[PDB]
A paper describes a structure:
Recently, a new bivalent strain of Clostridium botulinum, IBCA10-7060, was reported to produce BoNT/B2 and a previously unknown BoNT serotype—“BoNT/H”. This novel toxin is a mosaic molecule and is now more commonly referred to as BoNT/FA (as well as BoNT/HA) due to a LC similar to that of BoNT/F5, a HN domain similar to that of BoNT/F1, and a HC domain similar to that of BoNT/A1. Here, we present a new crystal structure of HC/FA at 1.95 Å resolution which reveals further structural information that is unresolved in the reported structure. Specifically, our structure reveals a loop previously unmodeled due to lack of density, which is of high importance, and we also observe a disulphide bond which was not present within the previous structure. We identified crystallisation conditions which yielded crystals of HC/FA in space group P422, with two molecules related by non-crystallographic symmetry in the asymmetric unit. However, it further reveals the presence of a loop (R1261–R1268) that has been shown in other subtypes to be involved in ganglioside receptor binding. Crystal packing has enabled neighbouring chains to interact directly with this loop, provide sufficient stabilisation to produce good electron density. Yao et al. (2017) suggested that the lack of density was due to high flexibility, which is consistent with the high B-factors we observed in this region relative to the rest of the protein. The specific ganglioside receptor for BoNT/FA is not yet known; however, considering that GT1b binds with high affinity to BoNT/A1 and that HC/FA and HC/A1 are structurally very similar, we propose that BoNT/FA possesses a similar binding specificity.
Residue numbers in the entry: 862 to 1218, 1225 to 1288
The structure:
Amino acid sequence: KYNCILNIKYEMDRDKLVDSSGYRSRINIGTGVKFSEIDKNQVQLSNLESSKIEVILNNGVIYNSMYENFSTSFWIRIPKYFRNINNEYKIISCMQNNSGWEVSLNFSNMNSKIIWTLQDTEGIKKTVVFQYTQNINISDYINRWIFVTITNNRLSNSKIYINGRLINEESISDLGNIHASNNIMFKLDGCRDPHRYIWIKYFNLFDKELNKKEIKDLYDNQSNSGILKDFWGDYLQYDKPYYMLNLYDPNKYLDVNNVGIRGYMYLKGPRGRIVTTNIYLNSTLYMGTKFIIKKYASGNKDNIVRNNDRVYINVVVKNKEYRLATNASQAGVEKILSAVEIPDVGNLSQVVVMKSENKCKMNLQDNNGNDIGFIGFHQFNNIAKLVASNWYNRQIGKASRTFGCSWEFIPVDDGWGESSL
Ligand SMILES: [Cl-]
Ligand SMILES: [Cl-]
């Protein structure tokens, strides 16, 4: 759909990235490309000569035009910058004889930038920029998967959409003929920092200007909404430790008062800060008590957490794992949660239904499969204790805001460095 003229997608039969658009453009993958073992569409391009992908376009879809509209879309994940770049570097190039289109990255004045450049055969350039600050407590963008869509209307504007939403437009109507290349080079080109890399997936080209609705539907269809995601946007997994971010108070972190059914877990603050003047100023994410999601009812062989999976939650306390559990017979709607010894869980409630996209992800069950409530928090004499509460289940269908039950799961990731765990 959408006049797609290139659709880079992993194919099991040939066991490689191929063009699935129907035009059979050849995809040459360098030896220095790395792939995710969990999602084989995710590819990592590092700052090495062999870490490159080259597309040899079907000769009928090469762009050589003054008036034809075209669009591109892709997902990208860019590590946090710890050093000034001021050093714009290419990542996706379709240029010949100084004409064509190009995606480049830069980091300047605490802003990470994604730059779209068009250049016509008279040498006239137009650029459109998406940028985001590194001076921010918790970013929607730093080191997290971003869905990018760039549309080009030769009569008027080039537009950048980010996660399905128009965020910038620049006039391109004065550009003349644009004669782009026979091939597309995916490769960090001109980057002076040897540690830089990117992750990318699902690169597409379209020979029209996509509209708002097509882009939102593209964002949704490529989102894999049946699979829960961690904070970085990767697949949520079993047997993987996660730090917990509560979106209703993000400046707090999780702690355990004591283990055992008489103890409780609670949110304390403030979150720390990781700071270097004129480079970054962020809240620390690798803090507090870790959760590990454990398989219960799911029979899938793989370690991917899916919508409506029934799981156990283990809690890590001084390098030892306990079970998140509660006695559903305690008084009140709010059931205070405990970290109990795994052999001693007995008949305490412990089964959690995981829910993908609000963002309330954990619905605790009793052993009749009845809802005890989403896991959130509640104030008990100025202590914000962790609770399962059916108040959430009655409420999150009424409004569309953040609730105390809205969480993100944060694993340690190479693209986000901190001193303390
Ligand atoms: Cl169009
Ligand atoms: Cl999710």
